[PDB]
Every structure is written in C-alpha cells, then in structure tokens.
Design a protein around this ligand. Structure first.
Ligand SMILES: CCc1c(C(=O)NCCc2ccc(N3CCCCC3)cc2)[nH]c2ccc(Cl)cc12
Ligand SMILES: CCCCCCC(C)(C)c1ccc([C@@H]2C[C@H](O)CC[C@H]2CCCO)c(O)c1
Ligand SMILES: CCCCCCCC/C=C\CCCCCCCC(=O)OC[C@H](O)CO
Ligand SMILES: CCCCCCCC/C=C\CCCCCCCC(=O)O
Ligand SMILES: CCCCCCCC/C=C\CCCCCCCC(=O)O
Ligand SMILES: CCCCCCCC/C=C\CCCCCCCC(=O)O
Ligand SMILES: CCCCCCCC/C=C\CCCCCCCC(=O)O
Length: 473
C-alpha cells in the first residue's frame, strides 16, 4: 500500500468507449458461439461422451466464463472507474487467470489422448475411457483454480509488503514468474509434445506386386530352402513379455514330428545372448530355420510380411499392435495369444489364437495351421487385410485431430503470446505510460482467441458440422 489503484486507469474517455464497443461485440461474438458450441456437444450423444472431443467442452467453457468475467470486470474498471475490495479484485481477476490456465491444461490432456490414440492404437480404447477422462479434466481444473486463488491466500504485494507489478494490482512480481513460468514451460512441452506425435506419425499392400506364391518362391530361394510354409516372428528376444522363448520351445518340439519337413521358420530379433545362442544353434542344426539378428532393412521386413503367410506373435501381452497391424495390412495371418489388444484384432475369423506363454499349445496350433486349404487360407488373409483398413482409417482420423489441436494451440500462442511477453518485461523493468496503455488494447486478444476457437471447430471437426445439421436442418 504505497501507490493507489487509479494510476492504472490509463484510457482517456475517447478510447474507453472504443475499447468498450470492442469488448461488448467481440465479447458477444464469443459468448454467442461458445454457448452454441456447448449446445451441439451435449446433445449429440457422440461428441458428448467421448474422450477424444471431450476437450471441446473444456475449451468452450473456459472461453465463455473466463470471457464474461473479463468483459464485465474490465469495462467496469477502465470505463466505470470502480475500485473493488483488495480480495474482491483478486477474486474477479482469479476467474480469468484460471480460465486461460485451464485451456492450456486442456491442450495438455488432449495431448495425452492424442499420443495414446495413435501410438497405442488398441490400448487406447481401453486406457482412455470416460471415467479416466472426467477425472483428469476435473483435477486439471482443480489445479487451474489453485494457481488463480494463490494471491487470495497471501501471495500478493499488499499482504506481503513486496514490490507490486506495474500492470496488475495486488499481485507480486514473483507470482508473475510463478504464473508465467509454469505456463511458458507448459506450452513448451505441449508444443514439443504435438510435434513428436506428428513427426513419428509419418513413420499399403498395393506396393507389392504379383502373386504371393511368386514373392514367397523368390524369398525362400534367397535362403536356399524349398517352397514351404513360411512362419515368421519379429521382435526383441526376451523371456519377460515377448514369446521368442515360447516360440523356440515349439520349433524344437515340432522337430520331433513328420510335419516338420514342410515347415519353414524364419525369426528376427535381438536380445538375450543366451536366447540368441539358442536360436542360432537351430539355424545350423536344422536346414529349414533361418534366424536374422543383424542389419534388417525396414522395407525388407516389409517384403517379409507380404511374402510369408503366417505371423507369430507369441508375446505374453501386446501393449500396442505394432506388428499385428502392419502384418495383417500386408495380408499375413497372425498367430498370437489373446492377451492385450490381440483379442479384438485377432479373432477366430482373422487368425489363430493360442495360450500365452504355452510352448506346447503353440506347437499344436502350428500343426493346425499346416492342415488347411487355400479356401480358408486366402479368406484369413482377407480378414487381415479388412481389419487393417479400420485402423490406418481411425488412425488417420486421429492424425487429423492432432492437427486440429495444433491449430488451436497455434492461435492460442498468437493471441496470448504478446500479452504474456508484455507481462515479462513488467517483472524485470518498469512500465512507462505508453507500454501500459498498449497492453489494455492488446488485452482484447483473449476475446479474439475465444472468437476464433469456435470458428476452427466448425472447420476441422468433421463430426461437429454433421451434428449441427442434425438438429438445425
Ligand atoms: C465435469 C468436468 C468439466 C468441467 C469443469 O468445469 N470441471 C471443473 C470441476 C471442478 C472440480 C473441482 C473444483 N474445485 C474448486 C476449487 C476447490 C477444489 C475443487 C472446481 C471445478 N468443464 C467441462 C467442460 C466439458 C466437459 Cl465434457 C467437462 C467439463
Ligand atoms: C498473473 C495474472 C495474469 C492476468 C491475465 C492477463 C489478462 C490478459 C487476462 C488480463 C487481466 C487483467 C487485465 C486488466 C489489467 C488492468 O491493469 C486492471 C484491470 C484488469 C481487468 C480486470 C480483471 O478482473 C488485463 O488488461 C489483462
Ligand atoms: C518449491 C516449494 C516452495 C518453495 C517456495 C518457498 C516459499 O514458500 O517461500 C515462502 C516465503 O517465505 C513467503 O512467506
Ligand atoms: C443487442 C446485443 C446485446 C449487446 C449488449 C451488451 C450489454 C452491454 C451493456 O449495454 O451494458
Ligand atoms: C452481435 C454483436 C452485438 C454487439 C452488441 C454491443 C453493444 C454495444 O455496441 O455497446
Ligand atoms: C515453483 C516453486 C514453488 C512456488 C510455490 C510456493 C510459493 C508460495 C509462497 C510465496 C512466496 O514465495 O513468497
Ligand atoms: C486485436 C488487438 C490488437 C492490438 C491493438 C493495440 C494497438 C496499440 C495501442 C496503443 C495505444 C497508444 O499508444 O495510445
């Protein structure tokens, strides 16, 4: 309590109405459509209860209540020259800082959703549910409320006798660095988060030409073995989760059988030196097993999925169907255990289900594979080709949404970036008359942001538009 509050009302009476009709219209064009964006969401049973678009409510609410507060209390201050209480101002201001912090945490939670929906394609539907998404936003909001009510708890320059900010009344210049700090680094990770998801997302069986018998007759000739039935395993060597130890226990016990001559096995991986010393012995002990644990070209392995006819995923549990999807897309019947996602991607009409970590029943399911016709075999390769299109499909609709989230994050950094940076110089230096009044006119960006956020839903979201013509035809 050294300087009074009126030294902050800088707008002369000609530029207090010009800033008013801006707040009242640009603040009406955001309340109208955000209150409308909330109407499409909660009617459409699709967008309402969905963890993918759940943020569009958490984004159109912080841009509505956080906007009506900033239109009332700002016009009631720079134009109506009102001096509230010392905790009534921080209450009215706390409702604004919480909202912006909340929409940052919305672009943060929506990034966890994006990473899971793309790089955990079938774990996603079972990790990110409606319960786990409702709890994550409510506690993301719980945090956004706390950071906003700190100066109401005693992190202010009045109740602490500290240098006040030249821009915000009743607020320390350290609470700024705690609020600009936690937000600039959050956007930094968030900006870095969506760029990792997009970069590693650009990382078709119509590229492989000819019949499969030809491409498999050319493959086994490279190894020097006869046209045989080619089983394939890909993945790290371990005994903990991948079933390479299970698979080697089956190839050995199948060797004591009459049906082993026709069976051709090919394994690639890298891991336990004793698991490698076990598999490489079979490669020279048998004339029909070849193990490749060195220099595997990523498009050569692409030729394997399309040349072979069976895929072996004997893992104890698949966290994400990385081979399961690429193999089936290239029409190679996968023989995996019904653990993890491999239950609803590999079924009794798409592949062969085995018991996890069971070496005997794995072999008994390799002999079953040897005794079936092309009628069945060509039909499984189709159902593997048909299941994959339902993935590179949704995983395409997912990738389009991680572009939408960046477009929202982009126009968030553009609107709130300059304001945030003008706050930064308040911490270090002082703010003269000019730099303090340009901030009040640049302050309108948090309303323009809430004006272009509902516009870009109606441009990117393919579902939200069709939901709009459904109740307003
Ligand atoms: C239902 C989630 C949701 C919101 C939303 O307001 N969550 C805020 C929930 C919440 C929880 C706790 C508090 N506390 C106040 C301070 C003291 C500690 C507890 C406050 C608020 N907004 C949404 C928009 C769309 C969708 Cl789909 C869901 C939501
Ligand atoms: C660490 C606090 C962050 C504040 C958010 C910045 C924001 C752009 C929302 C903002 C907030 C407040 C004002 C006005 C500053 C004037 O000095 C006093 C009146 C404020 C509006 C009343 C808020 O209840 C602002 O221009 C920008
Ligand atoms: C990190 C944990 C918190 C570190 C900040 C230390 C602190 O709370 O400072 C209080 C100060 O003494 C005002 O009373
Ligand atoms: C007519 C459109 C509604 C705009 C009115 C906003 C209220 C601001 C006021 O008059 O105090
Ligand atoms: C629709 C937008 C209407 C804007 C109303 C603003 C009232 C005013 O200009 O003071
Ligand atoms: C990030 C580090 C922690 C900041 C939260 C604790 C600060 C509250 C006490 C106020 C003060 O430091 O004077
Ligand atoms: C959208 C709002 C964009 C920013 C407008 C800022 C204009 C600069 C105001 C300067 C005030 C002055 O120098 O008198």
């Amino acid at each position: 309590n050294f300087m009074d509050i009126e030294c902050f009302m800088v707008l002369n009476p000609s530029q207090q109405l010009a800033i008013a009709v801006l707040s009242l219209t640009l603040g009406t064009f955001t309340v109208l459509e955000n209150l409308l964006v909330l109407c499409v969401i909660l009617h459409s049973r699709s967008l309402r209860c969905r963890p993918s678009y759940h943020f569009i409510g958490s984004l159109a609410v912080a841009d509505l209540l956080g906007s009506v507060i900033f239109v009332y209390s700002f016009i009631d201050f720079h134009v109506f020259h009102r001096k509230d209480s010392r905790n009534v101002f921080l209450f009215k201001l706390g409702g604004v800082t919480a909202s912006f912090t909340a929409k940052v945490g919305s672009l943060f939670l929506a990034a966890i959703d994006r990473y899971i929906s793309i790089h955990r394609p079938l774990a996603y539907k079972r990790i990110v549910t409606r319960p786990k998404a409702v709890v994550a936003f409510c506690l993301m909001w719980t945090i956004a409320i706390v950071i906003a009510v700190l100066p109401l708890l005693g992190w202010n320059c009045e109740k602490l006798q500290s240098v006040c900010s030249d821009i915000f009344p009743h607020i320390d210049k350290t609470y700024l660095m705690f609020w600009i700090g936690v937000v600039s680094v959050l956007l930094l990770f968030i900006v870095y988060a969506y760029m990792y998801i997009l970069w590693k997302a650009g990382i078709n069986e119509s590229y492989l030409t000819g019949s499969r018998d030809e491409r498999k007759k050319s493959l086994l000739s490279k190894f020097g073995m006869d046209e045989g039935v080619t089983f394939m395993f890909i993945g790290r060597f371990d005994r903990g989760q991948k079933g390479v130890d299970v698979l080697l226990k089956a190839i050995e016990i199948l060797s004591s059988k009459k049906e082993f001559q026709e069976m051709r096995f090919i394994i690639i991986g890298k891991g336990d030196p004793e698991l490698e010393g076990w598999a490489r012995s079979l490669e020279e002990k048998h004339g029909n097993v070849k193990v490749i644990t060195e220099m595997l070209s990523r498009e050569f392995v692409r030729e394997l999925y399309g040349s072979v006819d069976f895929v072996i995923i004997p893992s104890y549990f698949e966290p994400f169907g990385l081979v399961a999807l690429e193999a089936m897309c290239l029409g190679a019947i996968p023989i995996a255990s019904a653990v993890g996602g491999l239950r609803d991607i590999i079924t009794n009409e798409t592949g062969i289900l085995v018991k996890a970590g069971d070496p005997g029943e794995l072999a008994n399911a390799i002999l079953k594979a040897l005794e079936l016709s092309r009628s069945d075999l060509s039909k499984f390769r189709e159902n593997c080709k048909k299941r994959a299109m339902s993935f590179s499909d949704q995983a395409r609709m997912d990738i389009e949404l991680a572009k939408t989230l960046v477009l929202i994050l982009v126009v968030l950094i553009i609107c709130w970036g300059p304001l945030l940076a003008i706050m930064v110089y308040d911490v270090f230096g002082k703010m003269n008359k000019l730099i303090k009044t340009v901030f009040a006119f640049c302050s309108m960006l948090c309303l323009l942001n809430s004006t272009v956020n509902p516009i870009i839903y109606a441009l990117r979201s393919k579902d939200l538009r069709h939901a709009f013509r459904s109740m307003f035809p």
